[PDB]
Amino acid sequence: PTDQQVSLFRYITQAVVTAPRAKDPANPSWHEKMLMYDPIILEDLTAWLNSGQLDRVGYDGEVAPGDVKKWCESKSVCCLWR
Amino acid sequence: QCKPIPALYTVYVLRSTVRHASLYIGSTPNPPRRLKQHNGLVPGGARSSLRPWEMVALVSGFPSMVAALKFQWALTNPHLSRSLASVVANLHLLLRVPSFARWPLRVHFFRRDVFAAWEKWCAAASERLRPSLAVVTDFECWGIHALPLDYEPIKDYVAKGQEIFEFERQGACVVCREEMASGDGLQALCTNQGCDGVGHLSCWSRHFLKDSILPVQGQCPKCGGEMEWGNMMKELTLRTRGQKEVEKLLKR
Ligand SMILES: [Zn+2]
Ligand SMILES: [Zn+2]
């Protein structure tokens, strides 16, 4: 919606969907968790996004949880605060 | 999440029969019991003056309780996003809002008056509602007492996976074609009976979406049938997490 988020959203999408799929079905990846309609704790996802997963897909800097929540809602991903 | 996709979770519009103008918006996985509580027959409800209440309509298929509550609050508060006219119109917009547009939802109406307002509003609607969003009616067991509260409507589907994955008949993925080992990642099974096509979970999503993260509708590569992403996940999560829930279903 905002002119600056639209760039950040393309990266957040990338980092989530390019992360390696899980080899253990009990501990799925973040992309797989959204696929199965899991409620997504924003603190956990935002922290994972700042672990180095955004530097991998070419976004230097840091993301705020509110920006991540707006990402989830644009993709119909169920999310919630902790 | 640690529990499988609930067998049923609804967001309902409750109306008084004493006063047709009094509406109430809650949620429950068991509409008959919650209606019994709203009418004092079962302990647990929130004012007899307006009893007995009725469920004129409800939205079903919320893949998690969290999701159903995110929706319930969003409809009790349209000023941050009263009457049957506004409830019907707010419901129509929320179903197009991106935060809920791709959820495995079904809209149920139970009163010809309330369903009439829905059609009156859809006739003037700005955007058309997504055709995958089933809007069904059920007037005058009927109504809410027809909705299946358990996992029975997918009993055979669940039994199919219990065979394919217990005996390692999973075969090779039907998208990437690479041979999948047993318990090697999340492997999602097709829904249509007679077919045993299995694939890696992220491969189906890649396939259904040919921009987006969450699939909605799609066709099977092996058998050519059509599936809704909600059902395929309701079985995957049932198999991954709900081992106890599966046993009670098949009497095992
Ligand atoms: Zn695959
Ligand atoms: Zn098939």
Residue numbers in the entry:
A (entry chain D): 844 to 925
B (entry chain C): 4 to 49, 54 to 88, 114 to 172, 197 to 266, 271 to 312
From the paper:
SLX1 belongs to the GIY-YIG superfamily of nucleases. When bound to SLX4, SLX1 cleaves various branched DNA substrates near the branch point. Slx1 comprises two distinct domains: N-terminal GIY-YIG nuclease domain and C-terminal RING domain which binds two zinc ions. The CCD3 fragment of Slx4 bound between these two domains.
These apo crystals crystallized in the C 2 space group and diffracted X-rays to a resolution of 3.1 Å. The phases were determined using single-wavelength anomalous diffraction (SAD) for zinc ions at a wavelength of 1.2828 Å. The overall structure of Tt-Slx1–Slx4CCD3 was very similar to Slx1–Slx4CCD3 from Candida glabrata, which was reported earlier. The main difference between them was the connection between the GIY-YIG and RING domains. This region formed a long α-helix in Cg-Slx1–Slx4CCD3, whereas it lacked a secondary structure and was partly disordered in Tt-Slx1–Slx4CCD3.
